[PDB]
Amino acid sequence: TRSSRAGLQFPVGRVHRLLRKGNYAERVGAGAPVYLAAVLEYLTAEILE
DNA sequence: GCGCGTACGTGCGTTTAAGCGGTGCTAGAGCTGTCTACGACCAATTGAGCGGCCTTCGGCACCGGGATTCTGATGGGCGGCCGCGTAT
Numbered sequence: 319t320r321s322s323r324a325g326l327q328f329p330v331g332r333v334h335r336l337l338r339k340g341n342y343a344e345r346v347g348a349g350a351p352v353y354l355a356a357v358l359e360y361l362t363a364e365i366l367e
Numbered sequence: 368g369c370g371c372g373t374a375c376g377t378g379c380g381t382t383t384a385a386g387c388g389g390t391g392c393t394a395g396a397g398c399t400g401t402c403t404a405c406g407a408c409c410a411a412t413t414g415a416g417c418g419g420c421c422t423t424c425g426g427c428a429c430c431g432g433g434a435t436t437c438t439g440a441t442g443g444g445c446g447g448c449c450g451c452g453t454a455t
Contacts, residue, residue: 329415345405346405347405
């Protein structure tokens with residue numbers, strides 16, 4: 319389930335919703351919620367340490 | 368302020384390559400046309416997430432008890448007080 323299937327530490331089923339409610343393009347590409355959680359986690363980790 | 372030094376502006380001549388308009392070629396943008404996959408939407412169920420509320424062990428810095436070391440009144444014995452004092 320999202321983190322699982324994706325294999326990330328970030329919420330994949332949270333940024334998908336905001337990107338569709340922000341109202342960016344007409345519909346949303348399937349690519350992004352998942353990809354978009356990934357880089358975010360990556361940045362998150364780069365600072366903490 | 369002043370004074371020394373030199374580098375950077377202004378000139379001419381030499382030189383080098385942009386800009387002009389001439390043609391040719393085909394690549395890659397733009398259009399166009401059909402399919403269908405993927406995202407929005409509506410539904411119903413489920414647990415991740417937020418407020419509300421209070422947890423426990425480890426680490427900084429203040430602490431604890433027991434043997435041991437150093438200071439003080441005590442005391443017999445060898446010496447010195449020279450000055451009042453009794454005896455012949």
